[PDB]
Structures are given as structure tokens and as C-alpha cells.
Design an enzyme around this catalytic site. Sequence first.
Site, short mmCIF file in Angstrom:
data_model
loop_
_atom_site.label_atom_id
_atom_site.label_comp_id
_atom_site.label_asym_id
_atom_site.label_seq_id
_atom_site.Cartn_x
_atom_site.Cartn_y
_atom_site.Cartn_z
N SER A 150 0.80 -1.21 0.00
CA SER A 150 0.00 0.00 0.00
C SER A 150 0.84 1.27 0.00
CB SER A 150 -0.93 0.01 1.19
OG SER A 150 -1.63 1.24 1.24
N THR B 220 -1.48 2.68 -8.36
CA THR B 220 -2.55 3.44 -8.99
C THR B 220 -2.00 4.56 -9.86
OG1 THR B 220 -4.20 3.01 -7.26
CG2 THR B 220 -4.51 5.00 -8.59
N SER C 143 -5.71 5.93 -0.76
CA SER C 143 -5.71 4.48 -0.84
C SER C 143 -6.91 3.93 -1.60
CB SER C 143 -5.68 3.88 0.57
OG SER C 143 -5.68 2.47 0.52
N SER C 144 -6.64 3.01 -2.52
CA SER C 144 -7.69 2.36 -3.31
C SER C 144 -8.27 1.28 -2.42
CB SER C 144 -7.10 1.67 -4.54
OG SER C 144 -6.18 2.51 -5.21
MG LIG Z 1 -4.07 2.05 -5.07
#
Ligand SMILES: [Mg+2]
Length: 776
Positions: A180, A185, A235-236
Site C-alpha cells: 500500500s 494506482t 488508498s484504493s
Molecule cells: Mg491504489
Amino acid sequence: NPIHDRTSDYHKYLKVKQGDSDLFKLTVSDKRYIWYNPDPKERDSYECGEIVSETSDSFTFKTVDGQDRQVKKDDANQRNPIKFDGVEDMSELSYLNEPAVFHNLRVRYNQDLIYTYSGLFLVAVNPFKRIPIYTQEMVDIFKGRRRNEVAPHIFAISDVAYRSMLDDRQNQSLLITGESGAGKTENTKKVIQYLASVAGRNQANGSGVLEQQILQANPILEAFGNAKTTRNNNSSRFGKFIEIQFNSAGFISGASIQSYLLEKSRVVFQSETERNYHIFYQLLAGATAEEKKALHLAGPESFNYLNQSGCVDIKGVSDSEEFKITRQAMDIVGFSQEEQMSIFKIIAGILHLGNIKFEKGAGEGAVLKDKTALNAASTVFGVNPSVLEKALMEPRILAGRDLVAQHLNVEKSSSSRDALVKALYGRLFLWLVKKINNVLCQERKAYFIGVLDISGFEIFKVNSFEQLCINYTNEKLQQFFNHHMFKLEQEEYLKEKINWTFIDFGLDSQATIDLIDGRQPPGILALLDEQSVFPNATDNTLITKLHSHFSKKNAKYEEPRFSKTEFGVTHYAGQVMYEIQDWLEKNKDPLQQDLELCFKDSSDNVVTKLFNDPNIASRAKKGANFITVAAQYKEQLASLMATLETTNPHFVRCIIPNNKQLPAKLEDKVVLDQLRCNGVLEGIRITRKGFPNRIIYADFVKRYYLLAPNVPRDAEDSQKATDAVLKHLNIDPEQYRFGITKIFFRAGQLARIEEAREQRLESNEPPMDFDDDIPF
Ligand SMILES: [Mg+2]
Ligand SMILES: Oc1c(Cl)cc(Cl)cc1-c1[nH]c(Cl)c(Cl)c1Cl
């Protein structure tokens, strides 16, 4: 040419700076150095030392403090000659060891060079700051070039996957790994931008609208799917597989997004320091006063779902500003003005449902004294306040073929309310993806390049079911890399009878994967499911049963001595302790029927579709029980993994520098752990010790035309016509090799040695025109 112009932004932001005359003197030195640990305990903290003398089996150096130490030549991590410092591809390093690799990344990082190749794959170290390397100018740089011709960049590997898609007619995939915050992304966005550029149609009506919508699909998903966690401000909280479709010709014909594991529980709870999904904050701070009064919205501090973490804003992010970008994105993709309003009247509704305060009545059952929140929710959702109230506190269920109304206590009514909230959000999120897919999906493409952007490996003080699914997924992705880099590679050589002695790189996390998803014997998820459909099972019977099967029996499992509600799983990225609380209910993911009935009658079009649409409101049923979340996910993931197996994988390893989200702070301990568990060095070794390229004997008549004894495309004997254009320049014989049906090349002969036969400016039309039309 920007590339060959030492003044271009390209040479300024993607190339290593020209060393000065002082650095030259050091580069031409005869002295040798070694990387050692000043403190034998701190094995990741290295210092440089000069080798002053040697024995047949050891080196003696000098510690920065002037001290002298001796080590065996076998346990020595020698330092590469500094001409290598900054090298763009580390497979070229003379000494391949941990300190050496980390050093090269450091040298490049210190100059804002975040990309570096490690053989076939790319490594990306999160800079935590902006670097002008993604402009349209940069894109047009890397469009059409050889990986070895341009500097390392996410665009480069993107173009390569793109060229391979055409030259081979095979589907490709960009697998971007990382814990993370690493940068998965952000890099995913670049892959799409690049592909929507070099492959999009001339920006025009539709000709430049499809690829324009593709780009606007993500900002939407982010506002509803991303949130601030202790490890990443953006954060996804859901996984994503993006398919970029191309027509037979090679142009973008569309795309589709497949989402995975939305963290629904976040809507009703957030750890100290976290935030709920961005969308909630963007709404409250970006809506008009009329919209604000129409939805009865106040400040974030006046909602239970937003005033428990102690954090309502993110440093450097204007939620009011982001709300504009989301809306503007929804317009472009194609969301009606009513739809959007509906979308916010569910989001606003969710906030109200959160304010409902249940209380102990005269008995044990709950009662709702103040109905302000209740009526406001009903209001914006368009449902009967009285019906929702009864459904929340007195839902009807069957008991031996008998309809008996329940009267849930305070705790249970609260949970049911949360259950309703999570179902609304999760369905809403699913709807958006569906809506978006329909707009981008409108053509039968042939080839596609899949971009995987999953929630990265994460560890928190308290890890629950969600984290297990996330880490299990990262464990699979890592094994996918292990497979395609070490296993499949060596089974090739095997059947290819190229004479290779098998190598065990020690990278295999199948034990951990089995422990989680195994069926026979049953893994954690299996035992979990079994308990989930057991009538008398509890979080306690679950933890006990898990310990019973694995404690002191599975090497990747641990029954802690300090707790009775947690179990540890040893993952590739480290051991994680999981709290068992609520796992059964989370796995069953229940929702009172009455609650659904209540909403199936909503006067709102979006709301009704979320409860009447089979592919959204329905649940796959396994016999007399619904399919559990564990089983559904396992199913989804196995499918995805099945899809990637049918593509040609391109890997990008994202690396987080530290744990503070700070720029210019590359912590060695943090980086080395990642380099080790990702198998970065083993991946470099496998390339240096192996043969990546391998052409078939038949089609070996490709770039090999008459550059030897005259032998055109034709030959009637293949094993023979093969060692024929090679021996002319007397290429090294053990620099390649002959296999049962193919010809292998070590460290890329096609590029290393083959530079005269090919890549020339002579040999096509100059070796044949001396006497064109003039011979007497
Ligand atoms: Mg992400
Ligand atoms: O969230 C859900 C709950 Cl609580 C119950 C049931 Cl029976 C189904 C769902 C559900 N279905 C579908 Cl389809 C999606 Cl997406 C989600 Cl979320």
C-alpha cells in the site's frame, strides 16, 4: 532530437546527470571497494569500505572509522565500479547483491530518477512529489522506440506491451505490484494515458471522445472507492482490472473495468486517523447551499460516519475542489443530471442512516425516540419512514415455516442499519462501474492489454477479514511473478533440452496460498465457510477450529500465545496477525429481507435499480444457503488469474521508499525488505544466467537473410539452416544454444551481438547498388 539533446527536458528529467572532472578521476581509479555492515546486527545498514589486501579466500578492508576487517570472498558483497552507478538496467551490474542493487536505485532516486529496469521488468520507487515526466511531450518521446533506446519509464514498458500486441497478435497485461502506497494506482493512470494517446483516434467527435471518457472513468471510481488510510492518503479500497481494447487495425475500440473487493465496512467505521470514502467529504464541502438544504446536509462533524476518526481533511487536498472534478467527470462519461442527483441522495441518505440513534426500550428490544435522522433518510431515499423503522428494529423472518416479527436489541438494530448502509454503498459502487462499462463497451475488439491495479499489501494494528483477502490477493500476484519468471522459464529450458541444470531461487509462496484457499485439506477460507453455514457457530468456535487445524501443524500459521482471538499468517511480505471478530457475519454478509422490500419500493430510479436489478441485488445461492463472500471472491480471483494466464505479462514493481509518505527520504530497511520479498534480485539473476529470447527453428528465417553462405528465407533442413548466418561473424558459440525445437540467446544476443547484421544503415540497399544500371 530530444533524446540526443543534453538540454531537453527528457535529458534533464530522465537521464543521469553528467559527472564532473572530479568524478572522472574517481571513475578511473584502480581501488576496489566492498559493502559491509558497520553494526553486524543492522544487516540493512551498509557503509562503503576499501579493499586493502586479499588472500586466496578472503578480503581485508578498512572501516570508515579506519578499522580493518576480514571476510571470506564468498560472503563478500563487492561494490560495483562506479561507472555503473545509475545504470538504467541492473542486469548489467558486475556484482549482483543487495547493497549493490539498493545503491544503484539510491543513486538514481537521489536525482529524481524513479524508474529502473531489473532485466525484463521495471522497478518504480515512489517519489512522493511531482516530477515533470508525464507531459504529452514525454509521451511522444517513447512512442515507437526500443526499450534499450530510451530511458526507463512506465511509458516505455507500455509501448513495449503495445508493440508486442501487434507483432504477435497476442493479448498483453501490465501487472503492477506493490504494498500500500507504493505507487500502483498512479502508474496505472500513466499506462492508460499513454495507451489512449499512442493508440487513440485523432481527438475529435467520438474520434477523441471514447479515449476521453476512458480517462474520465477513473476519477469517478476514485471518489467512491479511495480513502485515506494510515499508509496512503489516496488508498484504493477496491481492486481493479482494466481492459484496453483494440480493433484489428490497432486502434482503441474501448475498455471495460472489473472491480474487486470494495471495502464496504469502511462506510460505517474508520480507524483513528483514517477517513471514510472521499465522496462523502467532497459532497458536504462541494455542494450548493440549495443542494445542501435539499439533502439536509451539515458539516462532517455532524455525522457519526465522519466524526469518529478525528480526521476530516487531507493535507493538500481540497475536497470542495475534488467534488467539481468528480461531477465534471460524471458529465463527460454520460451520467444524467437526475442520476447524479440520485447518486448524492443515496450518499446523503447513508450519512443520515448513520445518525439514527437506537435505544433500549422498556424491554430488551430497541426503540427510536428521535426520528429526525430516520425521517431525513427516508426523505432523500424516497421510502416510507414507518416501514424502514419497523424493518430496522422489527424485521420479519421465517421460523419453521412461520412468519414471526423480530425485535432486535440496540446492538443488533445498529448492525442491521450498518448492514443496510454497506449494501447501499456496495451496490451503488457496482452500478457506477456497470454504467461506465456500458459507455466504454460498444465494440467487438480482438486484442486487449489488461492493466491490474489491486489494493496493495497492508498491515494495521487491527487486521480483519478485509486485510486477509487483500493480502491473499497480493500473495497470488507475487506467485504469478514467481511462476512466469522462474518456473515456466525453467520448464521451457527443460523440454527444450538446452542442457540446463535446474536452479532453485527459493521463491515460492504456495504454502501460504494453500493455507488460505486450500480445499483438501481445508484452508482458512474453507473452514470459515463451513462455520458460516453452521447454525451454532461463533467467532470463538471459528478461531478454535482454525487453531485446531493449523496450530503447530502448518509452517505458515501461528497460534499466538498473547491472544485468543487472533491467528498469524506468514505472507511473502511478512507475518500478519488477524483479529477474528465479526468474521462470520462479514463472510455471510446478511441483510434483512424487510430492509430490501422497504427499498424496492423507493420512488427514486437509481435506488430501485439497486434493489430490483438481478445482477446487482441478487446473490448467487449455493443450495439452501447463499454463496459466501470468501467463496465468491476466491471464484472471482481465480477467474482473473485465468485471464492473465492467456496474456503476455509485463511486470512493474512499485517500491515505497519509507513509511512516512515523505519525499527525498529513501530508507534502506524499508526498501530492502521489499526488494527481497518481491524477488527483484532473483529476477535479475535468472536473466543473466538464462536465455530470454527463443525463436523457432522453422520461423528462424525472419531477420536472418543472406548475411552468410547464401541462404534466403528458404532451406529444406532447419536445424542446419540455423547455425548458418551465425557462424559468419563467428558469434560466440556458448553465447546461445540449440534446443529440440528452438534457438536460445544469452543475455539477448539479438541486441548485444546482433548489431551489424541488423540495426545497420548499410546492408539492405548499399551492399547491392554499386553497379546499378551502368555496367558495360
Ligand atoms: Mg491504489
Ligand atoms: O451487498 C449485498 C448484500 Cl448485504 C446482500 C445480498 Cl443478497 C447481495 C449484495 C450484493 N449483490 C450484488 Cl450483485 C452486489 Cl454488487 C452486492 Cl454489494
